[PDB]
Curated annotation (Swiss-Prot):
Mg(2+) binds at D338, T340, D681. InterPro entries: ATPase_P-typ_cation-transptr_C (IPR006068), ATPase_P-typ_cation-transptr_N (IPR004014), ATPase_P-typ_cyto_dom_N (IPR023299), ATPase_P-typ_P_site (IPR018303), ATPase_P-typ_TM_dom_sf (IPR023298), ATPase_P-typ_transduc_dom_A_sf (IPR008250), HAD-like_sf (IPR036412), HAD_sf (IPR023214). One of its GO terms (biological process) is response to endoplasmic reticulum stress. This magnesium-dependent enzyme catalyzes the hydrolysis of ATP coupled with the translocation of calcium from the cytosol to the sarcoplasmic reticulum lumen. Involved in autophagy in response to starvation. Upon interaction with VMP1 and activation, controls ER-isolation membrane contacts for autophagosome formation. Also modulates ER contacts with lipid droplets, mitochondria and endosomes. In coordination with FLVCR2 mediates heme-stimulated switching from mitochondrial ATP synthesis to thermogenesis. GO terms for cellular component: calcium ion-transporting ATPase complex; endoplasmic reticulum; endoplasmic reticulum membrane; longitudinal sarcoplasmic reticulum; membrane; plasma membrane; platelet dense tubular network membrane; ribbon synapse. It comes from Homo sapiens. Residues 767-987 are annotated as: Interaction with TMEM64 and PDIA3. It is found in: Endoplasmic reticulum membrane; Sarcoplasmic reticulum membrane. It comes from the Eukaryota. It is a multi-pass membrane protein. Interacts with sarcolipin (SLN); the interaction inhibits ATP2A2 Ca(2+) affinity. Interacts with phospholamban (PLN); the interaction inhibits ATP2A2 Ca(2+) affinity. Interacts with myoregulin (MRLN). Interacts with ARLN and ERLN; the interactions inhibit ATP2A2 Ca(2+) affinity. Interacts with STRIT1/DWORF; the interaction results in activation of ATP2A2. Interacts with the monomeric forms of SLN, PLN, ARLN, ERLN and STRI1/DWORF. Interacts with HAX1. Interacts with S100A8 and S100A9. Interacts with SLC35G1 and STIM1. Interacts with TMEM203. Interacts with TMEM64 and PDIA3. Belongs to the cation transport ATPase (P-type) (TC 3.A.3) family. Type IIA subfamily. This is Sarcoplasmic/endoplasmic reticulum calcium ATPase 2. ATP binds at T340, E424, R471, K493, R538, T603, G604, D605, R656, K662, N684.
Length: 987
């Protein structure tokens, strides 16, 4: 059974062999369940923990360091510690990542429903209806639907028991109003879900109807199943941050290979016949170079900064489901959106209402955009005590009495939920907000305040019967008699032009006057203005009967009597309600436009309500033309390629689109080379939440949209998006700062190794020393720089370029030059202990390179064994550590030097610098640690010489910042504080 909206009832009955009155036998349901399967969707289709580490260990630099470590194991035939420690980091920066991907999930199913929906099915085993599970339903079952029931599977309606059927498909098609159904089939075979007015869909609940139908699809063949299939079929690429990091790692591998082949070419010119006894030094220098040219602490500090960003975002009720998705909202330029459920509260609510005061209209405006009865009334200002207006009392009566829906507090959710029609619920919450009898709303509880006003207004009035909302009359009536008394009233609510034409009287307060044409044209004009301009509403005319016909002759069997008896009515007023946008979007869209981020609203509703809400929230103006900024599904499908391109580049409101259409729009926007960020809550945004870069979902949305997303706004707030944009921008700035710092340090170490290897000097930096430096002494300052203060106007400039590099061009020179100097300094330190060491062997300047052979004494230099003393290695390590402390101290801002920003402005940076220095002193004076590698505590004059060698790096980088920025001052505290520190070392 492909589709049943084209075939009649008898057709599908013969196709399924099921009779409506009897039901299905046990053999039939058993065979259907074995052929089609259970009515349930799979669970998250995911992978366990045993494969995430293999997925995360596929990068390039990780393989380079693995090759270096395996070469180290080979040459390490006396316990070796160099290749082991780094492995621990490979477990520290990975598991934590996994710890995120699980934890976020633990924060999603916490706000999910726990009730398994049931279903009323007629089967041949029993005579009455059977309440069974939602999974054992098979195509062919006679399912009965009532008010408030959630449809369990795709159903083709067969018999509408009630006079009408209202279905709320806002979950699937985004329609804000309850759709009316009809048993008649639609001949359109390829009709959209908004055209099949004889079918039902899973998840969509019945608003105010009741009927019986046959099942057509189930499980995966249903609409939600097809959506989940299209969602899981779509692919999700990597975030731009990870792409930049991968490009940078590729460049790093390239430069490592280049410097390694350079060292190889330089070294092969001396040694011949690759001897294998001396080739161990070549492999040692190669692994030392390969580990010095790898920022082992960079992935750890990046994961730390991303985890801190996620911890900061989770305070805004935004569960982020991955680490690198915090920066994805930093470079985003477009933010797609959904009208129903995301921008609008999806809860119909009244905004204004007018009565007539012709001895002139009195128009009040109601505040509130949800189902919570905590709103207020406003005429112009000064919230009016509504007990004075007798006409408003009559309006409250005529509206609250003619109702069938209600509100109730759900303690499991914590929000007033509707039961029944949405529009009648908006009207009853109007009643609850506007109390004409001045009842108390402070001491009573919430579950009772949900209907206190309506129960009070229903005490003195006993509803006799109800004339249901018909099609041609398009107005519903209620006959009621006032309790504790000629005394009888018949209330009517309906379409404006469908009631005024039958309204032959006018109720000015408590005075009933005949009908005049002037006030009729006036109210008709004001109603046509209320629901056709930039503030289109849903108007409801209200009229009561002065002399209702008696009940003994009132016949409720014929359809024509519903209109014949509804004559000689008097107008009481009108009500205007709509699907209101959230109170935190009108300003957030402006704050997001200031940041140069365009906001598009893609939805499946009609273009009228879409453009109305789009004007109301602030994307358009009350008079702005929308001829080229408001497209329909058919309109977008009937455009040439260039037309579609300029549309998706200029349009800002798409209405009447399918989920596949949303995916098409998102992939067009991404084809325009710009990061997108789609939000949504329904089972229609899921195919387009995965296609987007950072798919955002709402906390009150559906499970499919929350599982096809990378963020879940639990509080449904929309300013959380701009907060996350700001946080992502700050995170990226800090990240590109500390990555450049780490790379400068690494290039310094690498040029030190290259110089000490090409010149011929003995080893000055062994790998394990580089491991410890790059891990601790480089991660503490990097983690400190990850807390840089945000820019004063970070949210006032257009989004970042998608192709900008982490290592700028000219800047790549800067952090190279200083870096090179670092290397030299380190080498110098070693050379110092071989030249001007007062307690060291002053080896000849031309015989220091020839150290591998010096063993017999052939010259004045003797003791050819001190060349492995811990003192030169300690000099090099100490000067490198202090030069990196100075580099991290001055790398606090991008362009402005220290003479325009003090280093103690970022207290975390100076704190981490002091901690790293005290830890470097802690590794000298302690007993067992200086025994792992080859170091030794230094003298006072040696430390002073190291400081004298390493301090000019700050002067070099200051003057380089100056010459890069140039093409009064705050130096007084600088020349007050740092002057003794510099004048004390040169005396
Ligand atoms: F929920 Be949206 F209107 F597609
Ligand atoms: Mg929605």
């Amino acid at each position: 059974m492909e589709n049943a909206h084209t075939k009649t009832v008898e057709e599908v009955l013969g196709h399924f062999g099921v009779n409506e009155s009897t039901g299905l036998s046990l053999e039939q349901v058993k065979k259907l369940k074995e052929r089609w399967g259970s009515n349930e969707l799979p669970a998250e289709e995911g992978k366990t923990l045993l494969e995430l580490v293999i997925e995360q260990f596929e990068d390039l630099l990780v393989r380079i360091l693995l090759l270096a470590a395996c070469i180290s194991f080979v040459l390490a035939w006396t316990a070796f510690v160099e290749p082991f420690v780094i492995l621990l980091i490979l477990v520290a920066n990975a598991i934590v990542g996994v710890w995120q991907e699980r934890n976020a999930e633990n924060a999603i199913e916490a706000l999910k429903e726990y009730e398994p929906e049931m279903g009323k099915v007629y089967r041949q085993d029993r005579k009455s209806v059977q309440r069974i599970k939602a999974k054992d339903i098979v195509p062919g079952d006679i399912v009965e639907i009532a008010v408030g029931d959630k449809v369990p599977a795709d159903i083709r309606l067969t018999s509408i028991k009630s006079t009408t059927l209202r279905v709320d498909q806002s979950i699937l098609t985004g329609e804000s109003v309850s759709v009316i159904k009809h048993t008649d089939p639609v001949p359109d075979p390829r009709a959209v879900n908004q055209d099949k007015k004889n079918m039902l869909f899973s998840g969509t609940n019945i608003a105010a109807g009741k009927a019986m139908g046959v099942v057509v699809a189930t499980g995966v063949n249903t609409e939600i199943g097809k959506i989940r299939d299209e969602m899981v079929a779509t692919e999700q690429e990597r975030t731009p941050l990870q792409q930049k990091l991968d490009e940078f790692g590729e460049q790093l591998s390239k430069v490592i290979s280049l410097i390694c082949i350079a060292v190889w070419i330089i070294n092969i010119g001396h040694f011949n016949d690759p001897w294998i006894r001396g080739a161990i030094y070549y492999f040692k220098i190669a692994v030392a170079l390969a580990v010095a040219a790898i920022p082992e602490g960079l992935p750890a500090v990046i994961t730390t900064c991303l985890a801190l960003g996620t911890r900061r975002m989770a305070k805004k009720n935004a569960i982020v489901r991955s680490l690198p998705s915090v920066e994805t909202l930093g470079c985003t330029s477009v933010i797609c959106s959904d009208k129903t459920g995301t921008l609008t509260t999806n809860q119909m609510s009244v905004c204004r209402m007018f009565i007539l005061d012709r001895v002139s209209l009195n128009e009040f405006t109601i505040t509130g955009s949800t189902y919570a009865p905590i709103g207020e009334v406003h005429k112009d200002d000064k919230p009016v005590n509504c007990h004075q207006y007798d006409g408003l009392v009559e309006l409250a009566t005529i509206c609250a009495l003619c109702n069938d829906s209600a509100l109730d507090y759900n303690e499991a959710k914590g929000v007033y939920e509707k039961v029944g029609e949405a529009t009648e619920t908006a009207l009853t919450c109007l009643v609850e907000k506007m109390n004409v009898f001045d009842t108390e709303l402070k001491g009573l509880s919430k579950i009772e305040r949900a209907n206190a006003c309506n129960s009070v207004i229903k005490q003195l009035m006993k509803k006799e019967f109800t004339l249901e909302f018909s099609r041609d009359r398009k107005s519903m009536s209620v006959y009621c008699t006032p309790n504790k008394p000629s005394m009888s009233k018949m209330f009517v609510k309906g379409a404006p032009e469908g009631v005024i034409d039958r309204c032959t009287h006018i109720r000015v307060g408590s005075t009933k006057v005949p009908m005049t044409s002037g006030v009729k044209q006036k109210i008709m004009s004001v109603i046509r203005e209320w629901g056709s301009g930039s503030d289109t509403l849903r108007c409801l005319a209200l009229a009561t009967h002065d002399n209702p016909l008696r009940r003994e002759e009132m016949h409720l069997e014929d359809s024509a009597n519903f209109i014949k008896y509804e004559t000689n009515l008097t107008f009481v007023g009108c009500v205007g309600m709509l699907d209101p946008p959230r109170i935190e979007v009108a300003s957030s869209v402006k704050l997001c436009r200031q940041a140069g981020i365009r906001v598009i609203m893609i939805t499946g509703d009609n273009k009228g309500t879409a453009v109305a809400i789009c004007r109301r929230i602030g994307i358009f103006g009350q008079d702005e033309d929308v001829t080229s900024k408001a497209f329909t599904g058919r309109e977008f499908d009937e455009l040439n390629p260039s037309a579609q391109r300029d549309a998706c580049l200029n349009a800002r409101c798409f209405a009447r689109v399918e989920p596949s259409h949303k995916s098409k729009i998102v992939e067009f926007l991404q084809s325009f080379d710009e990061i997108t960020a789609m939000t949504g809550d329904g089972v229609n945004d899921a195919p387009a939440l995965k296609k987007a870069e950072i798919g955002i979902a709402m906390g009150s949305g559906t499970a499919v949209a929350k599982t096809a997303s990378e963020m879940v706004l639990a509080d449904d707030n929309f300013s959380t998006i701009v907060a996350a944009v700001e946080e992502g921008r700050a995170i990226y700035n800090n990240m590109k700062q500390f990555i450049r710092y780490l790379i400068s340090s690494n290039v310094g170490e690498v040029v030190c190794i290259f110089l000490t290897a090409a010149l011929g000097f003995p080893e000055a930096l062994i790998p394990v020393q580089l491991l410890w430096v790059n891990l601790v002494t480089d991660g503490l300052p990097a983690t400190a720089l990850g807390f840089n203060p945000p820019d004063l106007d970070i949210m006032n400039k257009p989004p970042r370029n998608p192709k900008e590099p982490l290592i700028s061009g000219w800047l790549f020179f800067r952090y190279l030059a200083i870096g090179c100097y670092v290397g030299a300094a380190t080498v110098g330190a070693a050379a110092w202990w071989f030249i001007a060491a007062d307690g060291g062997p002053r080896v000849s300047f031309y015989q220091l390179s020839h150290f591998l052979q010096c063993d017999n004494p052939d010259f004045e230099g003797v003791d050819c064994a001190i060349f492995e003393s811990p003192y030169p290695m300690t000099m090099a390590l100490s000067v490198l550590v202090t030069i990196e402390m100075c580099n991290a101290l001055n790398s606090l801002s991008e362009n402005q030097s220290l003479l325009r920003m003090p280093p103690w402005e970022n207290i975390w940076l100076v704190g981490s610098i002091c901690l790293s220095m005290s830890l470097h002193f802690l590794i000298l004076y302690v007993e067992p640690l200086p025994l792992i590698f080859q170091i030794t505590p230094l003298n006072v004059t040696q430390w002073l010489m190291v400081l004298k060698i390493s301090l000019p790096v700050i002067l070099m980088d200051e003057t380089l910042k100056f010459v890069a920025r140039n093409y009064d001052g705050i130096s007084w505290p600088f020349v007050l504080l740092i002057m003794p520190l510099v004048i004390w070392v040169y005396s």
